[PDB]
Amino acid sequence: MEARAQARYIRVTPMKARRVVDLIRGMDATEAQAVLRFAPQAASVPVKKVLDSAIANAAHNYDHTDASSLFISEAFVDEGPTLKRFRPRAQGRAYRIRKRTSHITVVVSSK
């Protein structure tokens, strides 16, 4: 019953996103929302916003309204287009700073 959504170009570094997505692999869909709800990390907000699209797609598109037999089948974060800007530092030099992005994908399947 694989239904999935994903957010692309989400402005949070891939490692910081993986820190949270590695909690929500293979648990009940609702039980995963109740974990991202009470999660200190700031990446848990975009991730839970994608976890809700997956359930919304499962209910609407494929007519699996009951969102309690679902578990996270797949969830992974892919690298995204990095932005590059500079920073003035001591003695006239400049060090680069990369503002990384990520592509978060979540897949819910029936148990």
């Binding site: 490692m15 820190r19 949270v20 590695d22 909690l23 974990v35 009470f38 999660a39 990390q41």
Partner: peptide, 24 residues
């Protein structure tokens, strides 16, 4: 000090595994 060599993939990943969040 400065890194003497590029850290091998095995050694890099041994460490980053330790940078994990805890289930609430």
């Amino acid at each position: 000090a400065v890194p003497k060599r590029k850290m091998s993939r095995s050694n890099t990943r041994h460490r980053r595994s330790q940078w994990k969040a805890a289930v609430p």
